[PDB]
Amino acid sequence: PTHLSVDTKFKTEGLCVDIPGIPKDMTYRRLISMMGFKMNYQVNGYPNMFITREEAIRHVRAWIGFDVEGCHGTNLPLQLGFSTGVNLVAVPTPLMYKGLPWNVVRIKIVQMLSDTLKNLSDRVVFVLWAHGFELTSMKYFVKIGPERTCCLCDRRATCFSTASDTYACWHHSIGFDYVYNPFMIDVQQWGFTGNLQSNHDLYCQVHGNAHVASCDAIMTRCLAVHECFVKRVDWTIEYPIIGDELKINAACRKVQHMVVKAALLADKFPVLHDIGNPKAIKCVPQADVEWKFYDAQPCSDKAYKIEELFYSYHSDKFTDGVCLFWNCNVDRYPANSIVCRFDTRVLSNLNLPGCDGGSLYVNKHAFHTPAFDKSAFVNLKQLPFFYYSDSPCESHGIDYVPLKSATCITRCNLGGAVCRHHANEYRLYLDAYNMMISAGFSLWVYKQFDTYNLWNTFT
Numbered sequence: 001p002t003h004l005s006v007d008t009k010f011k012t013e014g015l016c017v018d019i020p021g022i023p024k025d026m027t028y029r030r031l032i033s034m035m036g037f038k039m040n041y042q043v044n045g046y047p048n049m050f051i052t053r054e055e056a057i058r059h060v061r062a063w064i065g066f067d068v069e070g071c072h073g074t075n076l077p078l079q080l081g082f083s084t085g086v087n088l089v090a091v092p093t094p095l096m097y098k099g100l101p102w103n104v105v106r107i108k109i110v111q112m113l114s115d116t117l118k119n120l121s122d123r124v125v126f127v128l129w130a131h132g133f134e135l136t137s138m139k140y141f142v143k144i145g146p147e148r149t150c151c152l153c154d155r156r157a158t159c160f161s162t163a164s165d166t167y168a169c170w171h172h173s174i175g176f177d178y179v180y181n182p183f184m185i186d187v188q189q190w191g192f193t194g195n196l197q198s199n200h201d202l203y204c205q206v207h208g209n210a211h212v213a214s215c216d217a218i219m220t221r222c223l224a225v226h227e228c229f230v231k232r233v234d235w236t237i238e239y240p241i242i243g244d245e246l247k248i249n250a251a252c253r254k255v256q257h258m259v260v261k262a263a264l265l266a267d268k269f270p271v272l273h274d275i276g277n278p279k280a281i282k283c284v285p286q287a288d289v290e291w292k293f294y295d296a297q298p299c300s301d302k303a304y305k306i307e308e309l310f311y312s313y314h315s316d317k318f319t320d321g322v323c324l325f326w327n328c329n330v331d332r333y334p335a336n337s338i339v340c341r342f343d344t345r346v347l348s349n350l351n352l353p354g355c356d357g358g359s360l361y362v363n364k365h366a367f368h369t370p371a372f373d374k375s376a377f378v379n380l381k382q383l384p385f386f387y388y389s390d391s392p393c394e395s396h397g398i399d400y401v402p403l404k405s406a407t408c409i410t411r412c413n414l415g416g417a418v419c420r421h422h423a424n425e426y427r428l429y430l431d432a433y434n435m436m437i438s439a440g441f442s443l444w445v446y447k448q449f450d451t452y453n454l455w456n457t458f459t
């Protein structure tokens with residue numbers, strides 16, 4: 001069972017206000033037919049427009065909440081809302097657009113999905129809290145058929161053009177008018193009691209309800225993210241490489257080693273309490289320090305309370321030496337800390353909008369991260385950029401312009417002139433650091449941290 005059987009039952013109770021008289025006994029096969037689409041017994045990679053929760057989780061980057069609200073059923077205008085915040089009014093003749101016929105509305109739908117999704121996914125998953133009008137409006141902007149490739153590249157087709165009779169992916173679809181072979185999922189099939197607003201507001205206070213279709217579309221995708229990534233966590237699902245994943249992760253390991261090594265050299269802590277990932281390894285294996293590990297999986301709901309991590313009776317004395325919290329999200333860090341905290345507000349192709357201010361960070365695996373909170377860092381300060389190295393000054397084996405920097409902490413810079421090797425190493429470390437920061441990671445340290453204490457390690 002890889003795909004969702006068209007003969008699976010679909011509960012129609014949520015559809016009966018917009019569709020009175022709808023049969024209680026309904027399959028996906030019959031629903032797709034009621035929506036005006038013919039599947040023709042096609043074994044060509046598109047077995048059903050609807051997908052399983054497991055297939056939806058694997059394709060979370062394609063999620064687009066979609067809701068349709070009647071403004072006044074072929075006679076009345078419809079308000080089409082998307083989790084991008086867009087509201088389009090389609091006439092059958094927070095961005096609110098005036099009423100227009102379907103022939104122009106569909107062009108706008110293709111442009112919007114193509115721009116939102118081209119750098120995220122190879123498809124679209126319409127995330128619904130289905131009541132009827134959204135399912136019956138699909139025939140006005142969606143075409144289905146066999147799986148196809150783009151006319152201009154090797155990617156799968158996501159759009160169709162009636163003007164040219166061709167197919168395109170999200171990257172080559174300018175001027176295309178139809179969404180081709182989209183996927184969709186109805187959250188209301190997961191067994192909920194009560195309406196969308198009541199279930200969404202149980203877990204989220206960041207998204208409100210003005211009463212427009214995009215507010216519902218946003219709430220729908222948020223509730224789906226809460227169910228699939230907050231209350232249920234799956235770190236075994238792998239996600240494709242769409243950007244700088246490898247470089248960011250490599251940069252994070254470089255910055256961690258640099259920052260921890262320098263903290264140990266500058267303040268000579270006898271003990272380090274490493275709180276976080278139970279699979280963590282010593283980031284400074286040669287350091288003299290007593291390294292003690294404490295297990296805490298990435299929190300996906302609320303940040304950990306420091307009282308629960310440290311108290312209830314371990315070294316017991318977390319106040320001795322230094323605490324290292326590398327992506328271990330806590331409510332209030334102790335003063336003796338070295339911290340890497342992902343800033344959920346960051347705009348990138350890796351970071352998707354999440355639940356209750358949190359974000360869904362997708363890099364190899366999916367990690368719902370609780371909302372960034374500046375008050376967690378009141379006992380610390382922002383860690384300044386610096387490069388430290390005790391390695392010999394020797395080139396071995398790309399061109400050169402002399403480096404002058406007060407933040408290149410090396411024997412050669414103490415001696416008045418940065419050597420070529422430390423200049424190359426400094427520029428590469430500065431690049432890794434900038435990549436990490438721009439990806440969304442923030443670095444914080446104990447107030448007494450001073451890089452001036454690193455110069456005396458060259459005696």
Ligand SMILES: CC(=O)N(C)c1ccccc1C(=O)O
Pocket residue numbers: 118119120121122155240241242243
């Ligand atoms: C690699 C990349 O940038 N993206 C968005 C993709 C991700 C999964 C499948 C296909 C694609 C594609 O568009 O090729």
Ligand SMILES: [Zn+2]
Pocket residue numbers: 150151152153154155168169170171172
């Ligand atoms: Zn293409």
Ligand SMILES: [Zn+2]
Pocket residue numbers: 200204205206207218219222223354355356
């Ligand atoms: Zn929400």
Ligand SMILES: [Zn+2]
Pocket residue numbers: 392393394410411412413418419420421422
């Ligand atoms: Zn040097």
